[PDB]
Write an enzyme that holds these catalytic residues in place. Structure first.
Site, PDB file in Angstrom:
ATOM      1  N   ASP A  35      59.124  30.049  -5.982  1.00 59.92           N
ATOM      2  CA  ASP A  35      58.086  30.723  -5.209  1.00 59.92           C
ATOM      3  C   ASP A  35      56.748  30.716  -5.963  1.00 59.92           C
ATOM      4  O   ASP A  35      56.556  31.517  -6.891  1.00 59.92           O
ATOM      5  CB  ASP A  35      58.534  32.163  -4.920  1.00 59.92           C
ATOM      6  N   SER A 199      40.154  25.201   0.978  1.00 61.75           N
ATOM      7  CA  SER A 199      40.228  24.004   1.796  1.00 61.75           C
ATOM      8  C   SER A 199      38.863  23.748   2.413  1.00 61.75           C
ATOM      9  O   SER A 199      38.117  24.675   2.667  1.00 61.75           O
ATOM     10  CB  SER A 199      41.299  24.153   2.894  1.00 61.75           C
TER      11      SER A 199
END
Length: 330
Positions: A35, A199
């Protein structure tokens, strides 16, 4: 040194991925959920409330000649999906894909929430975010990657998740046979303890690319892709009959639809998520309403590039002094 381990979806929807991990002496092999959105390595164990164990493989420290109680240390964690667990701490030898760390904090669960009990395929979590998020008290502990870092040929690990198929986690090297074209690297902020990056925008299907900054985390422990409501609305507007359902808990669509791809930007590069990756199947057995793999992050507080996004790429987690993230197509 290096390590290389295969990671395998737990079910037919790629809800999560498990990777075998050797703990203790002689080895006890547990299948853990790697994770990159948390920083605790915790396991089902011989100390876990018996009624809360249902099929998991447990770690038994009393059977490990290298286990040592970390006296006084406890842990307690809550995840973004509302699940939780807690317990005490041992140090022991931990190996992943041939890579061995001695003195790793292995957090032994005394209690786990129902979500974990009900998932018999996941024996624990191995956190790969920054150690500043580790919940061990009163002495915070380091992640497996942090402990391994100085021994690694290169201070990196990579995530190569499969679509309905096994993939790979590598430690300490970049497999140049595992991706196509070039890797595009992008800046990381560690200020919140996550692999947080920005992004450069998105496209829906064959549509034009929208340049826009989207702050988010690279999180292998989250199944879906969670983005701003504006973005998610633009995506689902291209699917006939798609709607957001409060009763179900997100966007659903007719199982008869063909889904468009979704593209996200990494600097000047583009990663394309095929439409099939965004299908998470009937909301309930036999239903003709299907659950979408792109959902709104509104009310989460952060955008999450979870498995839906990451499995479309070869992803480098660069843990150099100035950390960065790299994405390549594959």
């Amino acid at each position: 040194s290096t390590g290389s381990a295969t990671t395998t979806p737990i079910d037919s929807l790629d809800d999560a991925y498990i990777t075998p991990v050797q703990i203790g002496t002689p080895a006890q092999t547990l299948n853990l959920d790697f994770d990159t959105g948390s920083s605790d390595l915790w396991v089902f164990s011989s100390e876990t409330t018996a009624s809360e164990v249902d099929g998991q493989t447990i770690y038994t420290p009393s059977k490990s000649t290298t286990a040592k109680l970390l006296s006084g240390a406890t842990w307690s964690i809550s995840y973004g999906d509302g699940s939780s667990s807690s317990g005490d701490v041992y140090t022991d030898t931990v190996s992943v894909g041939g890579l061995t760390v001695t003195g790793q904090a292995v957090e032994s669960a005394k209690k786990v929430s129902s979500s974990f009990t009900e998932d018999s395929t996941i024996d624990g979590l191995l956190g790969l975010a920054f150690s500043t998020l580790n919940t061990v008290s009163p002495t915070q502990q380091k992640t497996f990657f942090d402990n391994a870092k100085a021994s690694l040929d290169s201070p990196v690990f990579t995530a190569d998740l499969g679509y309905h198929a096994p993939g790979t986690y590598n430690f300490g090297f970049i497999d140049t046979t595992a991706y196509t074209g070039s890797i595009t690297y992008t800046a990381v902020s560690t200020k919140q303890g996550f692999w947080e990056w920005t992004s450069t925008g998105y496209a829906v299907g064959s549509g034009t690319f929208k340049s826009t900054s989207i702050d988010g985390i690279a999180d292998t422990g989250t199944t879906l892709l969670y983005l701003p409501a504006t973005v998610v609305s633009a995506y689902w507007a291209q699917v006939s009959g798609a709607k957001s359902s409060s009763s179900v808990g997100g966007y659903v669509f007719p199982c008869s639809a063909t889904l468009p791809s979704f593209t996200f930007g990494v600097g000047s590069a583009r990663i394309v998520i095929p439409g099939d990756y965004i299908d998470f199947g009937p909301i309930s057995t036999g239903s003709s309403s299907c659950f979408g793999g792109i959902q709104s992050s509104a009310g989460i507080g952060i955008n999450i590039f979870g498995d839906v996004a990451l499995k479309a790429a070869f992803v480098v987690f660069n843990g150099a002094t100035t950390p960065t993230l790299g994405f390549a197509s594959k």
